[PDB]
From Swiss-Prot:
Family per similarity comment: Belongs to the G-protein coupled receptor 1 family.
Gene: LGR4
Reported disease: Osteoporosis: A systemic skeletal disorder characterized by decreased bone mass and deterioration of bone microarchitecture without alteration in the composition of bone. The result is fragile bones and an increased risk of fractures, even after minimal trauma. Osteoporosis is a chronic condition of multifactorial etiology and is usually clinically silent until a fracture occurs.
Taxonomy, superkingdom: Eukaryota
Role description: Receptor for R-spondins that potentiates the canonical Wnt signaling pathway and is involved in the formation of various organs. Upon binding to R-spondins (RSPO1, RSPO2, RSPO3 or RSPO4), associates with phosphorylated LRP6 and frizzled receptors that are activated by extracellular Wnt receptors, triggering the canonical Wnt signaling pathway to increase expression of target genes. In contrast to classical G-protein coupled receptors, does not activate heterotrimeric G-proteins to transduce the signal.
Membrane side Extracellular: residue ranges: 33-56, 119-139
Full-sequence portion shown in this chain: 565 to 705 of 951
Cell location: Cell membrane
Protein name, as recorded: Leucine-rich repeat-containing G-protein coupled receptor 4
Transmembrane annotation, as ranges: 12-32, 57-77, 98-118
Tissue-wise expression: Expressed in multiple steroidogenic tissues: placenta, ovary, testis and adrenal. Expressed also in spinal cord, thyroid, stomach, trachea, heart, pancreas, kidney, prostate and spleen.
Disulfide bonds, paired cysteine numbers: C54-C129
Cytoplasmic side: 2-11, 78-97
Length: 141
């Protein structure tokens, strides 16, 4: 909200917070669905599981988790590069490079999330729509 220079640390905190947005959104959708099915989950069970909603929620959760982890490694690598320049040169700036790396990490996360979609049955293993070694064994493992 403050129109400042937004240094690299603040931007990294912000983007990790956006990953937090998707985590919280996924969890809140879960609750919302559970509250809708208060005492009547079985009625919505199959419809949700085979429906597009389960795929959407599972992909969103997987993407949010993987993106959080990847943003974390990007932030740690950037901080280490800043420290290395501090003890080596005196100035570090890979703003465009790190933005490109963040976008590539988002691409990898989305690819991982969409991979179960093409195999027709990986995501609907559980109502939570979470990769488990219960149904499709090889790909999920």
């Amino acid at each position: 909200a403050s129109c400042t220079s937004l240094p690299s640390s603040k931007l990294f905190i912000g983007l990790i917070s956006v990953s937090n947005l998707f985590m919280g959104i996924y969890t809140g959708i879960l609750t919302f669905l559970d509250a809708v099915s208060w005492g009547r989950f079985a009625e919505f069970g199959i419809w949700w599981e085979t429906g597009s909603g389960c795929k959407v929620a599972g992909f969103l959760a997987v993407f949010s988790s993987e993106s959080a982890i990847f943003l974390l490694m990007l932030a740690t690598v950037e901080r280490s590069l800043s420290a290395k320049d501090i003890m080596k040169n005196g100035k570090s700036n890979h703003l465009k490079q790190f933005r490109v790396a963040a976008l590539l990490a988002f691409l990898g996360a989305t690819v991982a999330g969409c991979f179960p979609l093409f195999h027709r049955g990986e995501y609907s293993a559980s109502p939570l729509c979470l990769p488990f070694p219960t149904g499709e064994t090889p790909s999920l493992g």
